[PDB]
Design a protein around this nucleic acid. Structure first.
Lengths: 56, 49
DNA sequence: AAGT
RNA sequence: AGGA
DNA sequence: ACTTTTTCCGG
């Protein structure tokens, strides 16, 4: 469908970053993080995305 | 007054089991919620829904 | 225990 | 690990 | 060649 689902859109160019309510920081006590798995995984994406960008 | 029936009456070794009502009983009416789903927490202990 |  |  | 369900409720 030309308005909501063109084929070109199955190939990711710009990844949406979900907000914290989706990947909550389970912040036990004061000085201790406790970040979600999705936060770690998005970090790994960023980490890899920077290496590729600089590399090229 | 005497029962019209005669009862099967004698000793029988009975055991008490680990499940006792006041350890099982639970009620909730607004209480702690999940962080993610923002829904009632699980378990009697945790005052769950 | 079945079925793309 | 355990109840119905 | 290859995937997905299976009753309901202390740590």
């Amino acid at each position: 469908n030309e308005v909501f689902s063109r084929p070109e859109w199955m190939i990711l160019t710009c990844l949406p970053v979900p907000p914290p309510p989706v990947r909550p920081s389970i912040s036990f006590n004061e000085s201790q993080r406790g970040e979600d798995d999705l936060t770690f995984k998005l970090a790994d994406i960023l980490k890899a995305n920077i290496s590729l960008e600089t590399l090229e | 007054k005497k029962l019209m029936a005669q009862i099967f009456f004698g000793p029988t070794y009975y055991q008490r089991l680990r499940h006792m009502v006041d350890d099982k009983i639970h009620a909730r009416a607004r209480g702690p919620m999940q962080v993610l789903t923002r829904q009632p927490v699980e378990g009697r202990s945790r005052d769950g829904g």
